[PDB]
Symmetry: D2
Subunit: 281 residues, 4 copies
């Protein structure tokens, strides 16, 4: 029993309802201008991993545009932490399962921030089921529409604003590599993201645009209590070698590494931040 | 230059119009009852790799149900090769982008053959584009609906008919592992298939149903001249270490291995038949 | 974990199959040969027992003549020889220590002499010495493990090259541990990772000469390497950890080798066939 | 052609003899106390990647013990850069192909620095040959003794001194994943390092010691002109998608990430810094 049994009825989950509250910030973390003056669009940056990435990026001197569905309280709080760092922050609520909106958040980021340098595709929804026979066509399509189609549409719109030295980071998952028997459709979307990352990296390498991914293991975020039942929530992260789930702040440095010139010779790759699970990486 | 320059105007391609005709049968291949009495459903079994698999399976004593879109001439020919081995063959035309049709082919297979033992998900369409900006939502969704959603729907319908000792094989692609800059959407669907394979193997292992895949490299099939330009077609397969594309007959024994009790201790895996491209396999 | 086999241990490695309970199953009674390797001449190191015995017998059933190299298990090599010859093919026994370079050369020369040529090489010998941690791995054990597990693959394969031609094949036995790691077999796993990279590199080296190079990565297989390396407790629960919740039998590995050794895998080189009870290795 | 044709008649190579000199430092690199007060032992830290790692670690506040064979000029030069950052630097020459020396460098590091927190195993030699027949047993054993046996011996001796929160990083290579036809023995040592990394991570996880690796692609270091011929040297790095070899400084931030608390949820992994080569990572 790593975490207290709990569950939220609607997804996307709300961070402010969780106990304990995910740690999205490392108090000892010191920014060093790794992304100074850079303009970022992070989808799903209002909470969980996205929140921790937004704040770390702001600490590194980046201006952050945060897209999210409707978690206004969570998004505002994230905006407070971001602006505390003295950079610009824009909130872009809306449903990214709609192509047009995927285009709109990109246009809006460029209008308010002035330009776009770094795109972090990170939104997701997950609907556990005991087997394939319990996955309806409706859930299948919905899961793909937000998990992978949004990555295509937002990235596609961002391409007319990206130039040499710019970067794309996609949040995938350990399940793309290891599979998950109770998240078959979700896993398929994550495998799709991994192949997307690989192919797009090769497509944009000569344009000087790098494309990489982060594959988290079990991280304590609103996705967990809003998708899994209480029993499972209580044992979350107990399966990995470190015997604990990760906290969102533990993911941020991977994104900072991939987003900055620190990884100038890196494209088409995945950073596995998963508590010790070996994936032939 | 490996093949003569040629291009077919519509996809799915027609095998009888190709020069040279793919070699779908190994003259020296000797069946040994590896699948005697087994009932098989293979989607996309009318031509290319599926055609070679259908025929090898028939030489191994299995009854074959073949689903395909509308290539009646190719399907008919495949049927004559299968029947020559003295087994049953059932042709199932129709559009597998429709969920109900996915369910119907499974029901029809059971009706005609009596039961279902081996499912081979193998249908695909691919639409090369010079970059992500040239992929419409229409193309993206179409590509996913046939390449991965059909694998989900057909397999889901098959589950109520599969029992201990039964088997699922999914055709993926080298592109899920290596990426392909001109087939970003298609590669994404193949990455989805890889993860699907891994998750489903874990879901069904205690039910005694194995699930594996085959990742071909460049194989001479109707998919090639129906998707790529005449120039690309003429050099097809010159990029791999063996410096030639594979022939469909060269894929069939991997499917035989995975379909039979020869691989009784194998599940969740991928067989790479690609002319020597190293994929950290 | 749970008990999958009777508790047992052999305080001598390489292990002896005739002492095991139950005897591993190295033959599928229902397996039907179909001349996939008719007239081929094979050299298999460690072909006297476990996986190697199963491969020898299956290859014989496919029409291949088998030269079997092993260390000192004459009882096992002879019994294997009986099974091979029962399939109506030739069998040559090649005892000796493959941790010695010259002997690696000699077994190749001998094979060509008695069989007349060499078409297929299966590098399969291995020793393993579990330790609870790296601090318990001596330099002695380290070098010994490498010398037999990977140096012999280099030396035997190297000697085989002047005899292999277009259409010939090399198969190397690796292990799931090269992919997943194994905390109690750190040096062994390092030798298996070395074999994976050797397989990949050599495949590219020989592709234009028409010689294919592939490997098989077994999971937990009930063979003499198990009771002779692990303690009784560990042996009793062997194979309980994998998704299929059981160890594999040696006969369950042979068809992968047949696939890789024959023309059935003509468009395959540089690859690994994972036969491990369902462990996902990002394969 | 990427570099000037050049070649050194002895290995390990000497960095001061190279044209152009490898860039081991990013002038705009800003340290942020990521490793403040940490005590590091780096084998092969005198030149190439190791030099860039030593210097970046010094900028992050770490004290550096540098082991190397006998390249005293290079080691002294690296020492000056390290000490410029106000941290301690210890030089430890000697042949790590000897087990006792491997133990001695660890004992010496602990004596000079007070403790050991981070071990970077990075030493290597490589002897290209046109084929397996051209690899003598002498070369094979030499290659393994330094490339992998030293990693075992040095790490083994370090275990007495490592506790919760400490870290091991091993330098592997892309060749372990992709293979290399002219570096068959070397590649096998690097494949050994990958498996070593994975197994040791699982062995040490409950002790709170993380173990990860870095797999570089073609990096311009003394190893290159000292092993490859002038023709090959001149075209070095032109094979990867970014169409250039990497510079040592582009490797340092990955080591910084893996060495610091920034990767607290990362063990058993590999960071691929290779100019865009996809390796199913
Ligand atoms: N254990 C884990 O948390 C875990 C493991 C592996 C991967 N991931 C990945 O982490 C990423 C971030 O998720 P998280 O765990 O931080 O949880 P999260 O709930 O905090 O973040 C997901 C975000 O996606 C956004 N979103 C969902 N549907 C949307 C829609 N229709 N339109 C616009 N935005 C929408 C929400 O605003 C939400 O905040 C996801 O891609 C997820 O797949 C998470
Ligand atoms: N170079 C290659 O040929 C190559 C490489 C990697 C993977 N593959 C895979 O091999 C598999 C078989 O393709 P192939 O190369 O043999 O070409 P193929 O054209 O011979 O087979 C593909 C089949 O898919 C079927 N299909 C397409 N759309 C359909 C739909 N709407 N409804 C029902 N059926 C439909 C067609 O009947 C067609 O015969 C595919 O999954 C493909 O992705 C091929
Ligand atoms: N669970 C498993 O059994 C398992 C798992 C993964 C990989 N493998 C691999 O399978 C292969 C065969 O092993 P097995 O499990 O069948 O056990 P096995 O003991 O039956 O076969 C190994 C053989 O290696 C030979 N050998 C050992 N030292 C030798 C030496 N010094 N000189 C010459 N020959 C020597 C012995 O003759 C022995 O018969 C090995 O490469 C092993 O690493 C086994
Ligand atoms: N293109 C590349 O440079 C490339 C590619 C992939 C991996 N790598 C890896 O990078 C690591 C660093 O090498 P590099 O390229 O920075 O070259 P380098 O020559 O600058 O560093 C290697 C160091 O190993 C040390 N060394 C060699 N033999 C020794 C011995 N017997 N005893 C003690 N020390 C010894 C030398 O002091 C030398 O400085 C190596 O592990 C190498 O395999 C390099
Ligand atoms: Mg949220
Ligand atoms: Mg067709
Ligand atoms: Mg034996
Ligand atoms: Mg040096």
């Amino acid at each position: 029993v790593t975490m207290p049994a709990q569950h939220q009825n609607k997804q996307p989950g709300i961070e402010s309802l969780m106990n304990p509250l995910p740690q999205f910030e490392d108090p000892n973390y010191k920014g060093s201008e790794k992304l100074k003056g850079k303009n970022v669009l992070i989808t799903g940056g209002d909470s969980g991993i996205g929140r921790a990435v937004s704040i770390a990026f702001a600490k590194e001197g980046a201006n952050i545009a945060i897209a999210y569905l409707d978690e206004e309280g969570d998004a505002n709080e994230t905006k407070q932490y971001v602006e505390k760092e003295g950079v610009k922050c824009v909130l872009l609520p809306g449903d990214l399962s709609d192509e047009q909106h995927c285009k709109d958040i990109v246009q809006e980021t460029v209008r308010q921030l002035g330009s776009l340098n770094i795109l972090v595709n990170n939104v997701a929804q997950q609907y556990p089921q005991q087997g394939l026979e319990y996955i309806t066509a409706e859930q299948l399509e919905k899961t793909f529409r937000i998990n992978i189609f949004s990555y295509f549409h937002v990235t596609k719109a961002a391409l007319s604003h990206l130039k040499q030295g710019d970067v794309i980071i996609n949040t995938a998952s350990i399940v793309a590599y290891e599979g998950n028997e109770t998240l078959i459709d979700y896993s398929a979307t994550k495998g799709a993201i991994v192949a997307f990352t690989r192919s797009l990296s090769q497509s944009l390498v000569q344009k000087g645009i790098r494309v990489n991914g982060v594959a988290p293991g079990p991280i304590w975020t609103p996705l967990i209590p809003s998708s899994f039942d209480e029993k499972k929530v209580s044992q979350f992260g107990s399966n990995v070698p470190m015997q604990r789930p990760g906290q969102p702040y533990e993911l941020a440095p991977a994104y900072v590494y991939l987003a900055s010139s620190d990884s100038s010779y890196v494209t088409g790759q995945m950073i596995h931040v998963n508590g010790g699970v070996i994936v032939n990486g």
